[PDB]
Amino acid sequence: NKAISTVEPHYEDTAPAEKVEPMMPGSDKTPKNRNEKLTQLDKFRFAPQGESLRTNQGVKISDNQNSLKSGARGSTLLEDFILREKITHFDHERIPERVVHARGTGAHGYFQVYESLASYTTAEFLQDPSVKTPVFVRFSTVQGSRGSADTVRDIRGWATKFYTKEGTFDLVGNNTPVFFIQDAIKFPDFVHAVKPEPHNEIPQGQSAHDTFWDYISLQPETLHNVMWVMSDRGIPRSYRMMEGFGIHTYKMINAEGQCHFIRFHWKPVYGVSSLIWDEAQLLTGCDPDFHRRELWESIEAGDYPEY
Amino acid sequence: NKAISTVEPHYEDTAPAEKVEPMMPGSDKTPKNRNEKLTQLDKFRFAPQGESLRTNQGVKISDNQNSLKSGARGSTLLEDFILREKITHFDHERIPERVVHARGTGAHGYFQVYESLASYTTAEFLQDPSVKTPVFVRFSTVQGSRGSADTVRDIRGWATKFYTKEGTFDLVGNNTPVFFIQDAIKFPDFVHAVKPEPHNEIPQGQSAHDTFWDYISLQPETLHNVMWVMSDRGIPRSYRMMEGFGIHTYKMINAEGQCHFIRFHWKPVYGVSSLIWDEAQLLTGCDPDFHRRELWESIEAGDYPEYELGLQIIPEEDEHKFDFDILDPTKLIPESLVPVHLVGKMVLNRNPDNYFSETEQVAFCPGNIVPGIDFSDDPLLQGRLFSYIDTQISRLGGVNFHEIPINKPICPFHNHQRDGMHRMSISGTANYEPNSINNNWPREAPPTEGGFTTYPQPVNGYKSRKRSSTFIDFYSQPRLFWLSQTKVEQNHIVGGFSFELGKVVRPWIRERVVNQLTYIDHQLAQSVADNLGIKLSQEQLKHPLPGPINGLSKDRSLSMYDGHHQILKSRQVAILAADGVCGDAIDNIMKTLKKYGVHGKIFAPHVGRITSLQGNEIEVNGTIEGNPSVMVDAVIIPDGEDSIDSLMKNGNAKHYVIQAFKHLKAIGLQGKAFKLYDALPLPKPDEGIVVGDKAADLAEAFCNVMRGHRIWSRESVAQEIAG
Amino acid sequence: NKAISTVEPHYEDTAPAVEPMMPGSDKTPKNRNEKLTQLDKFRFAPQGESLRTNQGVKISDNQNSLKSGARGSTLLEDFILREKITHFDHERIPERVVHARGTGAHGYFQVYESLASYTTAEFLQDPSVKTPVFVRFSTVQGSRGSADTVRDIRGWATKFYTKEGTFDLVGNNTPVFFIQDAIKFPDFVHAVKPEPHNEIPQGQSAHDTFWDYISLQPETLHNVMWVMSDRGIPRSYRMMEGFGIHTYKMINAEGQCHFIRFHWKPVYGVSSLIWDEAQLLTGCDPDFHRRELWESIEAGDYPEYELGLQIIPEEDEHKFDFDILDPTKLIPESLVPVHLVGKMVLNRNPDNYFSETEQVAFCPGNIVPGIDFSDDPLLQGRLFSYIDTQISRLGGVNFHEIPINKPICPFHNHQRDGMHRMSISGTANYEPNSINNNWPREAPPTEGGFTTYPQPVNGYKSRKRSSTFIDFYSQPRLFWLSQTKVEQNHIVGGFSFELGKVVRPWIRERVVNQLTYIDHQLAQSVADNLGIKLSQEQLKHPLPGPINGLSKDRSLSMYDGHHQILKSRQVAILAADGVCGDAIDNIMKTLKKYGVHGKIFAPHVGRITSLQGNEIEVNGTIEGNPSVMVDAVIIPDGEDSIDSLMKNGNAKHYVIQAFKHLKAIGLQGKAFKLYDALPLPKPDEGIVVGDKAADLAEAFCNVMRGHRIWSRESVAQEIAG
Amino acid sequence: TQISRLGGVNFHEIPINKPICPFHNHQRDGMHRMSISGTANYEPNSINNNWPREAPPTEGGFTTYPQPVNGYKSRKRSSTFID
Amino acid sequence: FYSQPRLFWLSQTKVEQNHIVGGFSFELGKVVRPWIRERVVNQLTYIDHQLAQSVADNLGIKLSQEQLKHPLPGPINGLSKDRS
């Protein structure tokens, strides 16, 4: 019988004969969407088709269903290096989540300047419109851990990694033009206040708790961005439909050595739109992955985020 | 200048000088609940009252508001060591989450044995009823990451650490009596399949996706535990209202060397109660911390989680007398065959002071046994014994995690082990055995002196990788489970399969799962097929069904609602009121509810106080907006002309009643409040709708209705209601 | 049956029916301090205790894995075995990236009189307070298994556990460093560390990449001169000086800033090995300095040092011919004298090397109120580095909860979590809060809250070496000119031996070229040793002038400028069976009268028999304790002893070697026969010959006061030993 | 031991440690994951037709030789070792 | 601390202003300690008087005459609201 076969090594095909479309790796769905960075990554990709299942040392595995035992009903033997390698790796899959912005989602793309900005900066990636500068973007919330829901009321992070010829440039901004605090020495204090409270780790994904508003009430410098996050800016409809801001003033230095003060903005081509609070709360219940899913499906459908 | 003063060193008071209750550390709210483990933890606690803010080196900080800069408007200097120490620590706060059961909640308590079990085991913590064994317990889901929601559809994990005098005993279980797979080597496969998918990490806290069901349809050993989690068992109302199971067969050894096969159980004193799926999902939206908050507040309210420890006890010679292998962890032992003997009680009565120090860092492992208990040849259990110590090497930073205060035993623990990261103990004697330079101390302990010995089980066979033929039985117990369910319980099972499969994109996976169901029961298979648009073939409804199990076709204990009790105490009730409410009715409703250990919470259109028609002020627990009906077990609306009319202009308030209705809950209406029920497209009051005018008498009959848990007979008409 | 029992559980006593080195709690429990008392809670006493797993479960059989039969397969269910091996597998943590090789001890510090005039620091306020310390001494290049007596800078880190904070004085045994700006530190270290292809050489700067970097970075030459000198090979950590190097600030209660440089001056004098001797010692006792310090604490010859300060008023910062903020410059004690302000005693060895010495964490950013930083660009980069390194070395940001690292004063703040969090907090984790009335609270400066001295800051954001830093040869020249002639020779010896092991000849010529800018005699001597012809232009390179009218400074010379203490030194007494017993007694009693330790080395261990028939306990064999491990050698009379030693190549070689290492050798009676039979020149001032043992030993002790017979060095180079 | 010495369970991806033959399986993640996987991470699977696949022993899939095992679970030194 | 919050508030449409009011009221309605809600509402009287009143209404907080007369910040370089 074939019930016996399911607990024996599986040497035969499992896909059905015949062989609306599911989310899949970007390599399977958009292999023609290319840039230099993606090409650099190709050499770390696998093609398992036809390949034998192996240990990390390259050793072919004949039986992925059973530990090695003293007989078919016996005690598991310490000499099952295959079991122990398989379980060891699994036991250590996890790495720490980001201390803020733990919950996030990412995509590849490219950046082009419109025309040389040589009047303001020598930055290579801002000189030649013909350059296709690879980017990778991670959108995120702020307060919640990596399993928390997408459509919470929160600031959204927006981090863009520009892989330029003269260096990697990161623009690590948010979806509002200001921040809560003025000096970095207060960041742990502010983060601790907004995070789940230390005794019980409640609440997840929400600033609606005593310690956050205790801090606000005692630190009025926070009122401006609080205004922002209590608006509907704090519940965007999609990462494709929010603005982005470096928040800080930087400096651009041109080839003459003239400095301009500069502030970075992203303006979405698909506009700026938000949920309403009740719908945003209900979405955390029925699709905690909504923004992550939306971005992934939008790219798969050719509704490419453009900013 | 008061705006300026906020950004300057704060040397003055901040609390309001007067100096209902917020949740708090357990030391603040229940200091009188004590045990030996908690006392041990006291040496690591702090009382900052009156203390200077300092660096980790003990240097007093004068100005916690500003970095050190070249001027008030300059660049930050590298020499600001206070800044960097503060930000460094912050930057490295997070440690890896558990690889499974990442989302969890813990509590302290104690266990007591009812009377010595010395006839069955030498286990110290089971020999003396006068002892109070400290415990720590972590409840958890399985699939979600640490920030995922509580009331998902998932197995619940249940880990109890017994701090015994002869060692720390870890009982590491779940809330269903079986597991999905038979051999440890499949565990990463099964977990990878249920976890979010690796390309996009979707979905969170949900088995309703392709890879999980794909694995299921190809590994029919999983069908029994899938049945449990598709049932309402997969959505418990409370960690206090769920059953617990060690799952595996263990051995107990008594002082004469006789061996009994055992299985561990927890039976809740507060009964076994579940949510219904629609309610659970909505609850992930409006309180993702529901279970965790509920456990924390029940302990602060003195509704202490209580559970009885049970043992099924099989003498060694009855091992092969069953119609399944008791070494098979996909099989349960029917309670009608082998009764659960209640041998003790555990009470969780004290919350942690710091969730990370205690709940995040605690480490359980099934390997952590004590003399008197031993392992069986359960091939899942055997592989478990390796993983828990291994995983903790990176989760908790090395091999010294037993020195983290919550993990410390409360008995001595001398050995020759040394070093490792974050070594806290200081050893000044010989680090090898045997030694003569310290007269070979610490010394091996003979068995008659309580030294651990393995029971000399016979071992015969050939080295092999092969599933035991006594294990090839994937369908008999899924059928036993299904036949044991009431019809309402079977419908929720069918609903679980249908909702989950409906999110599976690849049709052939759905087809193959339904196919598996045709080997468990034909009604089950057919009903799931219809919800999925699958026409079953004639041959599939001809698929042979498994026979009975040691004379059993069903087992009442397998059914939640026909087989276990519902308890009123600890439940929550929303009292819907606005300004102008009858003050007397609120008084008498609140008092009647509490007479039965039921908590009434007033929800109004605003927080603070509402004024009664008598002109008295009533403290409000929260807004109706903020506390929707899925958060309570039942709803009551008192009288008051101006309160009822306010609520009839409130879509939230009206939806409260429609939703509570659709979720089969008790609804109590006093006086004019019935005009609010009449205006909704809800039918004539059923047996779970209670109307009257005397508020005390109404509250009494209401409480009596809430004893049914849910109004199941209402399930059919609630399907048409638009909410 | 008895062989059978050795592989069965051990339930019975194994203890049997001068002394070894032991943990401090065993050997000096009466020497205590506040920090040692704090550590007691973490100490264990397994006497009478069962062997147990880490979870508290007693173990019955620590001899066997759980198997499928006595001859079977080991079972995965053996959790006892797997927990034991697992802990073993993860014992090792990363070694320090520099100063990996080190040794630690507890003690205390006392200020002589309040320094309130210059600083508010609490541990410098009250002469009656005993402030606990922990000190780690180290070399710099080698990894943790490398040898003690290499040629290297020595690190010197003192953790003061004060009532208002833990203060770390992280210094070296020389007053300058090799580089000026922290950014160069990884370049310099990579150059000195073993070369990256072959990881050769261990514990030596004598290789191409180090001298390559020296040759391109003349700022390094000052400290190179120190390490090429005999300062690079201290006799003992008890007998070197110590320096914080950087200029720090000291703030008093008025807010007045004094510039400050820290010093340790050893009570036991400043003494060094000689190169050939040092190198041999890495061979026969790679733990020499650790053992000697451990044993000096157990002997009672407790390490003692006086803390010194050079004190410079703020308005004098720019009055020197060098930047006091330049870490390659020292402040000559002839210009700015060192005021001795307090005393450190090291009086307790640890119980567990790993728990205490290995895990201790120092950082120069660990200051306390009353002290502040200067703009020394080396020191500024150091402040970042120490905390950051400890993140991976000690596994996270809670290393301060490791018991050796804990302050003894309170340490409340709002920090939380991190790996292996010991503390359990229950109050508000953010400031400002009201839910806990904002405790813990900021402390006003007048209450001890740390504040930074408001130094002015004027300039432009730039990457530039200060022009006042560009002086590379004047202090090397001053240090050269301050050495005695024997010390200059050993400097020349240091450079020539090291450059001798450089393969690429252009590196050696480039270093010699640098030397021609310091002193022409030095360059010429090194060049001759390396077969290098110096051009005439090189011989004529211009030499720097005096520094604030100074061309020598006596304090820069070990032997002309510092004292040599007889107390605590070690003397080998060579003797076999048949030795004169009264001679030994008389030598011993005399040595002891001056605090010197006599060690009997014999051809076998146990006891030897004297010609008077008495038994004498032996300290070790001659072959096991060669002459490089002692300060001097004495040979008592006794016909059978002498005859035994003359048949012993090692015993004969013991005398030849000690001679060549310029050490005092005492010979009683027939013992001179042994010296006379050897290929040695006639006795000199350091060969004490006598017939009376007591007399001979008194004279022998007097010769030891000189440390070495420097005048012997010329003929020593012709000795075949 | 190598989990802490080499920083986690992907030390096989450090170049000197890499094998020179293929090595597909369903392991994933862990600290410093270099390789980028894009197929099903569980076995059995149907969405990628169960590749990578177990290999029959006659194809070179590892197998333990079926040595007989007979004894009692016990911690004991074999008498034949006592020499 | 208040000019830019006020500038943000006055640049919002009426709907957007109501949603901002809902944000504070919903969030502050899960705050258990009453003095925290009252202090937050007290900060809002330095931003806009209506905003403070609408939110204090939803929290059962009676504003005082002293509070309802709290000074409001002036325009920002002539600007009182910005469409962006």
Ligand code: HEM
């Ligand atoms: C100007 C306001 C700030 C903005 C807009 C901002 C933005 C972000 C964003 C978007 C991320 C997530 C990057 C990712 O996807 O991986 C992030 C991470 C982080 N930020 Fe901030 N941040 C700000 C302020 C701060 C401050 C003051 C600190 C503390 C000094 C801080 C520390 C961090 C840390 C530690 C992370 C985690 C980085 C990682 O693990 O990779 N940020 N920030």
Ligand code: HEM
């Ligand atoms: C009998 C079926 C099993 C049950 C009932 C069970 C139960 C649990 C529970 C309750 C936890 C969470 C404990 C806590 O921290 O609160 C847990 C964690 C874990 N289990 Fe299982 N498990 C089972 C099977 C397995 C298997 C087969 C493996 C793999 C060998 C495994 C590996 C793990 C690991 C690695 C953890 C995380 C431990 C940690 O991080 O501390 N379990 N299990």
Ligand code: HEM
């Ligand atoms: C005046 C120059 C310096 C002196 C006197 C000095 C002294 C020392 C000493 C004595 C130690 C060993 C401490 C112990 O026993 O644990 C040490 C360690 C160390 N130093 Fe330096 N150092 C100097 C310059 C530097 C610089 C420029 C850096 C790099 C910025 C640096 C980085 C380190 C590091 C990373 C350690 C290892 C710390 C640890 O692992 O605990 N130091 N230093």
